[PDB]
């Protein structure tokens, strides 16, 4: 029996889609921050590491279970400062991000979770990372006076800038870095001061003549 | 089933600022959840500090959240709504020390132990995934140090496959079982709601829950939660021919509050209405369209009104409401029962 049939459907998808906000403090203090998204759906959205810290992010399969990696069942990928990691479809069970063991002491990020945990569809999961490296002209200050309200890790291997703005000219006072076993004093001018650092590094003290705008940030 | 509670070996430091997520372990179905900041509050200057007065010591957790599957909330207070929300529902009984305003002996200490309750009705926490309790702690009281942990007890009922059945087994998707009553007691803040003498509009209840009651306080920059400011409460059903279930003075609804919770005033800038009591039943806006019942408040000044309600959804309501008057009996008198065990 040939069959010609014609037939125009209407229909329509109403299926729950409950969207997903949290940021946890990730860092020496706070090595495992732990977001449940269940097994039986699907999430799709950002993992964001807006901070200075490396984490290693394993998204596993199996629940109740893991806190390492558990082969075939969970992958890991490495993330660091700025870098997204991107879902798509990705049915996972539990998302658990470790501060690195191998970050220089100090450095923090607050992980964020922006996404929608929807059922899992008949279409590809995915993962990828957005944003790969900002060229990190990391902001470490900004502020006003002749001293520091607290004292600051600088996160990279890179060169520290002091900018300095007044009124004036010339010789504006001094900064104190430190390092390990090492401690270090320089002279600061009007504008920039630019000093190479290593990851780590501490800014102790900073001592002005006179008030001015201050600037820290590090080129890396 | 076999209802048996415990307290979880594990507990939560609570330090100042911070995000403590709980996992609550899924054994059976979860009735009710109690968290407890236990310890002492220390001062170690030389002059005595007396404690921040009400809302304190409550928002010592600035707010809770307990979802499953990490994104459908069960829970959504502040410590300072959940707080009130309990002393309410308990004659002002609820474990609270030290009361708003107690001296911390110049470099000696006092005792803290705050409690709260979320109530599951009968919880499917081996159905879901994930069932987790995120306390974010607000800021220690000033001069005086919180050196406490939360204790969570938490009660299973061994509702087993057997009974599962006998009350509709599962959902047209199997999640849960049909007869599941999900608490669903959120907290919607608004702000700068102006100084009117006429009640002007507050917000709306927004559908898709059951509404019990709903617990509104407002907050002066001035005095907190201590102020007199809302005079004239509203509750305006404004779908369908526009209609005043409630438009009593404060101090009437203060009143209906002595009458009903046997209990002074949590504050001047507090209260609860009942719904059963202005309705047949509880307020449904499950199917409602959005902005079908607002509330309104007649403030002194102008504040934030923060309004707390204690809802519940049924996650296969339809099925419930399409069941045969045979079967649909049965089913909505479990329905009927965990409805109400979700109080507080």
Known sequence: EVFKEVKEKFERYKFDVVYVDREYPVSSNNLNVFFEIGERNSFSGLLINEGQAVIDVLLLKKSHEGLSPIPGEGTGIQLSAGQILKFYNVPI???????????????????????????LFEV??????ENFQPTENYLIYSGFGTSL???????????????????????????????????????????????????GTQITNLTLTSSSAILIYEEV | GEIYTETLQQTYAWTAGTNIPIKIPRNNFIRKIRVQLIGSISNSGTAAVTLPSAPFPYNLVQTFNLSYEGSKTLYSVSGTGLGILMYYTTKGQNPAYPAPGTSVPASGSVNLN????????????????????????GQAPSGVSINASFYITITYERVTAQEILSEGGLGADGEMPLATVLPKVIEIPTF???????????????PGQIYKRQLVYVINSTSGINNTDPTEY???????????????????????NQAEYQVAP?????????????????????????????????????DNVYS?????????????????AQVAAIVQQYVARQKRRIKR
């Open chain 1, 93 to 119: 069970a539990e998302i658990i991000v470790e501060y690195d063991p191998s970050n220089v002491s100090g450095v923090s990020s607050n992980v964020k979770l922006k996404g929608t945990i929807h059922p």
């Open chain 1, 124 to 129: 590809p999961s995915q993962i990828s990372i």
């Open chain 1, 149 to 199: 309200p607290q004292t600051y890790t600088i996160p990279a291997n890179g060169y520290l800038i002091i900018s300095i703005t007044n009124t004036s000219t010339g010789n504006i006072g001094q900064i104190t870095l430190t390092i390990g076993s090492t401690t270090m004093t320089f002279n600061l001018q009007t504008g920039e001061n630019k000093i190479p650092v290593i990851a």
């Open chain 2, 114 to 137: 705050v409690m709260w309750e979320f109530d599951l009705a009968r919880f499917p926490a081996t159905m879901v995934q994930n069932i987790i309790l995120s306390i974010l702690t």
């Open chain 2, 192 to 206: 700068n709601v102006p100084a009117s003498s006429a009640p002007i509009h507050v917000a709306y209840l927004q």
């Open chain 2, 234 to 256: 509203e509750l305006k059903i404004v779908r369908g021919v526009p209609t005043d279930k409630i438009k009593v003075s404060w101090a009437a609804l203060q009143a209906e």
């Open chain 2, 266 to 302: 949590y504050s001047g800038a507090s209260a609860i209405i009942d719904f059963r009591k202005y309705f047949n039943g509880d307020l449904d806006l499950t199917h409602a369209p959005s902005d079908s019942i607002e509330y309104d408040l007649a403030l002194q000044n102008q």
């Open chain 2, 308 to 324: 707390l309600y204690v809802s519940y959804v049924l996650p296969y309501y339809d099925q419930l409401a399409a069941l045969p």
